[PDB]
Write an enzyme that holds these catalytic residues in place. Structure first.
Site, PDB file in Angstrom:
ATOM      1  N   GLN A  19       0.312  -1.227   0.050  1.00 25.69           N
ATOM      2  CA  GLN A  19      -0.677   0.558   0.155  1.00 25.69           C
ATOM      3  C   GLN A  19       0.891   1.099  -0.254  1.00 25.69           C
ATOM      4  O   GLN A  19       2.055   1.736   1.011  1.00 25.69           O
ATOM      5  CB  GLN A  19      -1.240  -0.208   1.355  1.00 25.69           C
ATOM      6  CG  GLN A  19      -1.608   0.724   1.765  1.00 25.69           C
ATOM      7  CD  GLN A  19      -2.971   0.717   0.238  1.00 25.69           C
ATOM      8  OE1 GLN A  19      -3.177   0.302  -0.295  1.00 25.69           O
ATOM      9  NE2 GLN A  19      -3.653   2.183   0.030  1.00 25.69           N
ATOM     10  N   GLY A  20       0.493   2.459  -0.940  1.00 23.34           N
ATOM     11  CA  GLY A  20       0.801   3.661  -0.572  1.00 23.34           C
ATOM     12  C   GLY A  20       0.074   4.750  -0.939  1.00 23.34           C
ATOM     13  O   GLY A  20      -1.326   4.756  -0.964  1.00 23.34           O
ATOM     14  N   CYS A  21       0.829   5.996  -0.920  1.00 25.73           N
ATOM     15  CA  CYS A  21       0.042   7.309  -1.285  1.00 25.73           C
ATOM     16  C   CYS A  21      -0.158   7.466  -2.357  1.00 25.73           C
ATOM     17  O   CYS A  21      -1.015   7.501  -3.313  1.00 25.73           O
ATOM     18  CB  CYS A  21       0.120   8.437  -0.220  1.00 25.73           C
ATOM     19  SG  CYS A  21      -0.746   9.862   0.353  1.00 25.73           S
ATOM     20  N   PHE A  22       1.078   7.101  -2.870  1.00 29.91           N
ATOM     21  CA  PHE A  22       0.977   7.107  -4.119  1.00 29.91           C
ATOM     22  C   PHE A  22       0.176   6.306  -5.312  1.00 29.91           C
ATOM     23  O   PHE A  22      -0.303   6.610  -6.001  1.00 29.91           O
ATOM     24  CB  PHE A  22       2.047   7.125  -5.093  1.00 29.91           C
ATOM     25  CG  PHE A  22       3.315   5.634  -5.025  1.00 29.91           C
ATOM     26  CD1 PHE A  22       3.162   4.653  -5.396  1.00 29.91           C
ATOM     27  CD2 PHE A  22       4.280   6.181  -3.663  1.00 29.91           C
ATOM     28  CE1 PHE A  22       3.613   3.973  -4.307  1.00 29.91           C
ATOM     29  CE2 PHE A  22       4.823   5.269  -3.537  1.00 29.91           C
ATOM     30  CZ  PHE A  22       4.168   3.673  -3.614  1.00 29.91           C
ATOM     31  N   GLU A  24      -0.903   1.279  -4.987  1.00 32.08           N
ATOM     32  CA  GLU A  24      -0.372  -0.181  -4.798  1.00 32.08           C
ATOM     33  C   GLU A  24       0.453  -0.619  -5.462  1.00 32.08           C
ATOM     34  O   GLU A  24       1.136   0.071  -5.992  1.00 32.08           O
ATOM     35  CB  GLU A  24      -1.816  -1.014  -4.917  1.00 32.08           C
ATOM     36  CG  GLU A  24      -3.162  -0.421  -4.090  1.00 32.08           C
ATOM     37  CD  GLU A  24      -3.964  -2.090  -3.851  1.00 32.08           C
ATOM     38  OE1 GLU A  24      -3.746  -2.866  -5.113  1.00 32.08           O
ATOM     39  OE2 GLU A  24      -4.039  -2.574  -2.914  1.00 32.08           O
ATOM     40  N   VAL A  25       1.200  -1.377  -5.090  1.00 35.82           N
ATOM     41  CA  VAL A  25       2.266  -2.032  -6.198  1.00 35.82           C
ATOM     42  C   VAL A  25       1.674  -4.110  -5.931  1.00 35.82           C
ATOM     43  O   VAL A  25       1.807  -4.460  -4.982  1.00 35.82           O
ATOM     44  CB  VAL A  25       3.621  -2.291  -5.391  1.00 35.82           C
ATOM     45  CG1 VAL A  25       4.602  -3.277  -6.076  1.00 35.82           C
ATOM     46  CG2 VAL A  25       3.852  -0.551  -5.115  1.00 35.82           C
ATOM     47  N   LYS A  39       3.641  -1.097 -10.510  1.00 30.48           N
ATOM     48  CA  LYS A  39       3.307   0.146  -9.635  1.00 30.48           C
ATOM     49  C   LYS A  39       2.341   0.864 -10.131  1.00 30.48           C
ATOM     50  O   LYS A  39       2.291   1.156 -11.553  1.00 30.48           O
ATOM     51  CB  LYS A  39       4.785   1.009  -9.607  1.00 30.48           C
ATOM     52  CG  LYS A  39       4.816   1.920  -8.303  1.00 30.48           C
ATOM     53  CD  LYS A  39       6.154   3.151  -8.206  1.00 30.48           C
ATOM     54  CE  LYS A  39       6.060   3.406  -6.969  1.00 30.48           C
ATOM     55  NZ  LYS A  39       7.395   3.970  -6.686  1.00 30.48           N
ATOM     56  N   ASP A 130      17.240   9.766  -2.519  1.00 30.32           N
ATOM     57  CA  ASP A 130      16.481   8.200  -2.340  1.00 30.32           C
ATOM     58  C   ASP A 130      17.085   6.506  -1.818  1.00 30.32           C
ATOM     59  O   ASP A 130      15.917   5.969  -1.836  1.00 30.32           O
ATOM     60  CB  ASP A 130      15.408   8.721  -2.013  1.00 30.32           C
ATOM     61  CG  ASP A 130      14.687   7.616  -1.414  1.00 30.32           C
ATOM     62  OD1 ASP A 130      14.507   7.919   0.276  1.00 30.32           O
ATOM     63  OD2 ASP A 130      13.150   7.191  -1.300  1.00 30.32           O
TER      64      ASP A 130
HETATM   65  C1  LIG Z   1       6.676  -5.984  -0.689  1.00 30.52           C
HETATM   66  O1  LIG Z   1       7.106  -4.322  -1.088  1.00 30.52           O
HETATM   67  C2  LIG Z   1       8.112  -4.578  -2.155  1.00 30.52           C
HETATM   68  C3  LIG Z   1       7.174  -4.361  -2.953  1.00 30.52           C
HETATM   69  N1  LIG Z   1       7.875  -3.672  -4.413  1.00 30.52           N
HETATM   70  C4  LIG Z   1       7.896  -2.509  -4.760  1.00 30.52           C
HETATM   71  C5  LIG Z   1       7.164  -2.177  -4.153  1.00 30.52           C
HETATM   72  C6  LIG Z   1       8.475  -1.140  -3.679  1.00 30.52           C
HETATM   73  C7  LIG Z   1       9.436  -1.217  -2.781  1.00 30.52           C
HETATM   74  N2  LIG Z   1      10.707  -1.242  -2.710  1.00 30.52           N
HETATM   75  C8  LIG Z   1       8.320  -0.007  -2.827  1.00 30.52           C
HETATM   76  O2  LIG Z   1       7.138   1.106  -3.346  1.00 30.52           O
HETATM   77  N3  LIG Z   1       7.624  -0.172  -1.299  1.00 30.52           N
HETATM   78  C9  LIG Z   1       7.655  -1.202  -1.127  1.00 30.52           C
HETATM   79  C10 LIG Z   1       6.234  -1.576  -0.556  1.00 30.52           C
HETATM   80  C11 LIG Z   1       7.458  -0.659   0.881  1.00 30.52           C
HETATM   81  C12 LIG Z   1       8.678  -2.762  -6.076  1.00 30.52           C
HETATM   82  C13 LIG Z   1       8.523  -1.784  -7.465  1.00 30.52           C
HETATM   83  C14 LIG Z   1       9.924  -1.030  -7.274  1.00 30.52           C
HETATM   84  C15 LIG Z   1       9.555  -0.098  -8.345  1.00 30.52           C
HETATM   85  C16 LIG Z   1       8.564  -0.072  -9.446  1.00 30.52           C
HETATM   86 CL1  LIG Z   1       8.359   1.354 -10.447  1.00 30.52          CL
HETATM   87  C17 LIG Z   1       7.614  -0.868  -9.136  1.00 30.52           C
HETATM   88  C18 LIG Z   1       7.597  -2.025  -8.334  1.00 30.52           C
HETATM   89  C19 LIG Z   1       8.646  -4.217  -6.537  1.00 30.52           C
HETATM   90  C20 LIG Z   1       9.535  -4.849  -7.436  1.00 30.52           C
HETATM   91  N4  LIG Z   1       9.850  -4.709  -8.876  1.00 30.52           N
HETATM   92  N5  LIG Z   1       9.949  -6.244  -7.216  1.00 30.52           N
HETATM   93  C21 LIG Z   1       8.918  -6.965  -6.093  1.00 30.52           C
HETATM   94  N6  LIG Z   1       8.146  -6.570  -4.742  1.00 30.52           N
HETATM   95  C22 LIG Z   1       8.267  -5.373  -5.322  1.00 30.52           C
END
Ligand SMILES: COCCn1c(/C=C(\C#N)C(=O)NC(C)C)c(-c2ccc(Cl)cc2)c2c(N)ncnc21
Length: 264
Positions: A19-22, A24-25, A39, A130
């Protein structure tokens, strides 16, 4: 209007990751075959023309330690499609069980990889702005990759460098600072740095010249490397070229007689 633009039927959203303010993922599947991460953007928390920039850097940037972009959907609601990283964020990975047993040499090799990612970002004249363990993604075989560089420059206090926190000087040298703090996450199993201190007292203590102590059972030579990363003058800090080379060779050049302990 772009070769990264994709129709919405190719993407099956499967599983909820964060979950996020921006927004979901998700995990998902692209065109039935490929396992992909997605994302998303919730309409009322950012505009469509604004979130254009989140993935502008991702379009131009390609390197083995940078989470790869597969696709986008510019029409709102937006979706950004990347490679799925099996093991999730690095912070979640160190805190939970799979890294109860991670000793120094797995950690130092992770650091060497992230540093490879950043030495590429250095060579292309960008800034992450960041860098920290919550924005590193772990994969199969402990491959680590530099992740959420949405709002990455084309020129959070505890991780951020002071000249950046205060005066807005966001340079590649403010990423070496962060990266130095990322070295204290790895070696404490993903704790929050500056333990027993709040964002307010951090800025004051740092500018007085308080740097973090050598975390228990960590080699002196590595804690020294953290202090080079946190030198007051931006230009007295070393670069992602020397860090990468240092950590790669660490156990031959700098710590050959290293013996495992309880935690590292
Ligand atoms: C469960 O936490 C891993 C989630 N996650 C994310 C998401 C995040 C990260 N880090 C994030 O925004 N915060 C987390 C919720 C704490 C991505 C992701 C990163 C960049 C883009 Cl452009 C698209 C998605 C991601 C990925 N590619 N593969 C596996 N898990 C991913």
């Amino acid at each position: 209007k772009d070769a990264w633009e994709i129709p919405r039927e190719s993407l099956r959203l499967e599983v909820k990751l964060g979950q996020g303010c921006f927004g979901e993922v998700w995990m998902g599947t692209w065109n039935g075959t490929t396992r992909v991460a997605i994302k998303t953007l919730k309409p009322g928390t950012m505009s469509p023309e604004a979130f254009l920039q989140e993935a502008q850097c991702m379009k131009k940037l390609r390197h083995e330690k940078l989470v790869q972009l597969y696709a986008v959907v510019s029409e709102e609601p937006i979706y950004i499609v990347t490679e799925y990283m099996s093991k999730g964020s690095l912070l979640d990975f160190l805190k939970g069980e799979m890294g109860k047993y991670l000793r120094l040499p797995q950690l130092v090799d992770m650091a060497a990889q992230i540093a490879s990612g950043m030495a590429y970002v250095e060579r292309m004249n960008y800034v992450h702005r960041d860098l920290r363990a919550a924005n590193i993604l772990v994969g199969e075989n402990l491959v680590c990759k530099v992740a959420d560089f949405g709002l990455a420059r084309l020129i959070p206090i505890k991780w951020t460098a002071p000249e950046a926190a205060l005066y807005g000087r966001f340079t590649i040298k403010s990423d070496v600072w962060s990266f130095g703090i990322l070295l204290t996450e790895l070696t404490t199993k993903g704790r929050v740095p500056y333990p027993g201190m709040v964002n307010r007292e951090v800025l004051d203590q740092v500018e007085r010249g308080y740097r973090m102590p050598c975390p228990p059972e960590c080699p002196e030579s590595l804690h020294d490397l953290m202090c080079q990363c946190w030198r007051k003058d931006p230009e007295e800090r070393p670069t992602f070229e020397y860090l990468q080379a240092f950590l790669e060779d660490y156990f031959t050049s700098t710590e050959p007689q290293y013996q495992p302990g309880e935690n590292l």
